[PDB]
Assembly symmetry: D3
Homo-oligomer: 186 residues x 6
């Protein structure tokens, strides 16, 4: 089958509305009731929870990513979303992990970090979609035998959306990517 795909001329927040727009169509065009978003402030899971219904999992950065100790999400939004039925999750990025701490001391690269860099060959959002997909799968916040739409972007906002089948951390290479709804061309 032939479907439309949107290539953002440039990566970034400028693109957040369109991405959420295609997510709506596709999701309905396919009957996907499972959504996984990368929202650190929450501005995205929110804008999405008011355009679709079903299962919205919002993943934010791990505790202390900008400044050790405190997490960039305030239970202030963790409620503005917990009200809308949106699941809220903070955990360790599955495509960095501890190998990240290591490489921070010693300065090399662990195997999963290479999975990330490779995925960033298409776009940054492309990589996070896969990452959050795994995170939620393992956190039991989403199915591993049903398609799902993961939403991500470059730094803030959204510019990448994928129709994919999550896989758990121990069966990570089972994760399949079915369709690319939107992505930054660069």
């Amino acid at each position: 089958m032939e479907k439309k795909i949107c290539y953002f001329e440039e990566p970034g927040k400028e693109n957040t509305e369109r991405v959420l727009e295609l997510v709506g169509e596709r999701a309905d065009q396919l009957g996907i009731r499972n959504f996984v978003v990368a929202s650190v402030s929450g501005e995205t899971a929110l804008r999405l929870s008011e355009m679709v219904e079903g299962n919205i999992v919002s993943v934010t950065h791990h505790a202390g990513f900008r400044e050790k100790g405190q997490l960039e999400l305030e239970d202030e939004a963790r409620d503005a979303l917990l009200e809308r039925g949106v699941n809220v999750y903070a955990g360790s990025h599955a495509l960095s992990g501890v190998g990240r701490g290591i490489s921070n001391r010693f300065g090399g690269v662990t195997p999963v970090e290479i999975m990330a860099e490779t995925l960033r060959m298409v776009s940054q959002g492309f990589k996070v979609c896969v990452e959050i997909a795994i995170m939620a799968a393992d956190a039991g916040l989403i199915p591993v035998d049903e398609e799902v739409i993961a939403i991500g972007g470059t730094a803030w906002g959204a510019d990448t959306a994928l129709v994919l089948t999550p896989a758990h951390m121990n069966s990570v290479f089972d994760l399949r990517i079915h369709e690319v709804i939107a992505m930054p061309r660069p």
Copy 2:
């Protein structure tokens, strides 16, 4: 200076009481306001809930640990736990991660998993104490800037537990374990 500890003859189930009680006593005698433990069902964290004050938390097996998309913390028990007034988490085990995915796929081991296995030299329960310890910190729950008490066990119980100032994954090795309370001798 000085303090006190204990040593199990053989590993297992039949120790969480002795562990718990003692882990509690010591836990209490030491005096802190932030905790963490490892129950794949919840029981062992059930017995714990009613003997401490502040922040208990019961990380469990990431979904799919046994069968794709099947966390074990029964919602009957999840409800129970959360209700008993104390936090619940499920995420990817900080000391294996996607790493275990690659290994399950290819047949060797990654850095991160090297660690679990080191720690295990002492006691299987020894490592989990660090594993779950780290996850908990990453979920924005427990501190990395004050002491916490780590409790865990081997196979089907809760035989080991320590005292450390856990840490995140991007600065992992900044983890400082401070005291041992109990552990299987072998």
Copy 3:
């Protein structure tokens, strides 16, 4: 930039005709004259040459891929292609390399082989697409300057075609994936 993208219900040689047609169109659309294509036997290379014009580079399997000291590409087929003006190349595979020799001897996985399994979560051709892009660049057979259309498939023929900018082995992570002309959905 909304465009079309074909999702093949299943992977395989059957899709070839459609992907060769789709590349033609996208090439005219973007003004691309560089094509790198994985063709073990050369058949796929042959077809493509008849629908597209410019620099076509066909890379076959490395000698020894199936039998020690043996090249799968028949002398006749090579001759036929070179007669048409298609640069034909063969060399150790970019996303496995000597790292595979190592694993065939010791079992685990080397860093470069992980990049490939990671690319595979999209499709097999998706992985050959960047792989042959790297090989062709290093051979000096295609530019790492401008855009190129990369074509790959599952074992026989073709089912994946990408629009990308190659990069050399020493600067792999400088490889950019721009558009997915077609890909097997599974």
Copy 4:
């Protein structure tokens, strides 16, 4: 069951006495016929020699640790040690090895060194206890089939020490640490 241990406020030199004395007491109270320690000069093993019965041994810094081909165990002290009636060794540190060669050359870390760093979370002195522990066993000296007492320290002393049934390198992970005696809290 149960036993006793201790906790240093800050790390160092000023503890080997307290350590030693106590490491001895406990060492004695526990009763065993095979020992091992970490003195880069020999002193700390001097103080030890006269307080135990059976097999003491004093592994030191591999030659070139400071300057090419310069072991530190002064022959004045080597003579002393060996004379005092108890074994002396010098070899490559079991938890870095050529690995550290590669890292010094390239800039990351190898499996083996991953371990040292894990162990160090507790105390720098914690790891050496395993390092020298393992070397000693490999030199045909101390047993892997009975308990041994491991003593070591941080910087310029002897602050940590354990009880384990060490192991070889070809079957390393079969190492079973059994008891803690003393250690720097941080």
Copy 5:
């Protein structure tokens, strides 16, 4: 089998003439007609072709070795060689590969790059000798069946020549080094 071996006091282009002469002799002696030679510019390849007969394969640097999208081998020099019957080849370097792209991005070392530093403890050419042997085999340019004379040097010209049996990338450790015709002693 007592034979001669030349040890050059120092490495470099100066030794070329002697190694080209020595290979000639050893080739007659053993009845070898396969030669793989590292010649970036092609000069060295040119000389060799005039003293030896049979299949000569000259491998130059991969495109991008010095400047993005650039091949060091001049079109003129290639032409000259091919005019003489010397198979000329270029492709990503066998003992670094994409593993170098990775390190250039993250710093440590990949497994394949260690093989090279290890080969280098003999001389630089010693390392290019097996490296170009692997590349030529995978290109199907030389056999992994019989013996071949491999020629390499330090940056310019030649100072190392080996008698070996190539092997493919997937069976690297099947590469056999038989005789060292000449090598820089340092």
Copy 6:
């Protein structure tokens, strides 16, 4: 300079006498008073100590290599050699190390083990010469700023001899190989 080298038609013990014979000449032809042998039973360091004088370091397998616990060398020969002025050493093989234990559990390969396999491309003895060279350097049993002759072989006896400059474990890639006295051609 042009020197003779012996290529054993086949690897093994059959070759032990010749190797020791060339060692004598070369050593004298060069003024090398430092010898490093790989002798597990001791049959070799012995046969050598009676044909040369200077510094003979005999290295045997690490404790329990065939059968954990006990070392293949009896203090019976450890004296028959300790009498002849020969230094006797048992330690952990520097080109295996702990990574060896790991790979024994998990089944992959660590970096140093790859250094070994690579070196075995020329001969097995070639590899051990480098290994024992390192072992002794670090054990302070030999110089790191003077040439030395390391002796090794395939399984038992000797068939490989190298004139090389040892390097310590932390500067391993400084080790230089100057001359190859004898080696098995296969």
